[PDB]
């Protein structure tokens, strides 16, 4: 058997849940897993195409094999932590700054 070469039509004994949008939850389309926010789509896709790669070679939009709806993929891992303190000799307070 092959791995990731054609639209899903065999697979194995796996059920299905509901579809939630505007959330950074884990998804699983065509066996390939991932983590990102699934929102609306405004691009153009052909009926015989499923996955899609950009310049970074990352699945940004996968087609739902259940409803044939294009959903964009965008991970919420976008931030940083930076603590700024004036010094322990003055006071004992800090300032939480995000990147």
């Amino acid at each position: 058997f092959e791995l990731l070469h054609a639209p899903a039509t065999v697979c194995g004994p796996k059920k299905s849940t509901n579809l939630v949008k505007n959330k950074c939850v884990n998804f699983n389309f065509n066996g390939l897993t991932g983590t990102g926010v699934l929102t609306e789509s405004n691009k153009k896709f052909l009926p015989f195409q499923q996955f899609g790669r950009d310049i970074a070679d990352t699945t940004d939009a996968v087609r739902d094999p259940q409803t044939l709806e294009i959903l964009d993929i965008t991970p919420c891992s976008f931030g940083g932590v930076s603590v700024i303190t004036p010094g322990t000799n003055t006071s004992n307070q800090v300032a939480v700054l995000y990147q």
């Binding site: 791995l3 390939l32 310049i55 070679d57």
Partner: protein
């Protein structure tokens, strides 16, 4: 753009995605495939900083 292309190379492995190898190989046997992806990226990061 050079570091972006390093994420797609296998560096002598079977897959360049960390979510794909774990879904097909058991941890006690996938240690030989994850090490090839980590070692292949340390050379690009060391060269970039240099």
């Amino acid at each position: 753009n050079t570091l972006v292309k390093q994420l797609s190379s296998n560096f002598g492995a079977i897959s360049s995605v960390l979510n794909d190898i774990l879904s097909r190989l058991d941890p006690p046997e996938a240690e030989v495939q994850i090490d090839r992806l980590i070692t292949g990226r340390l050379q690009s990061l060391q060269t970039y900083v240099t």
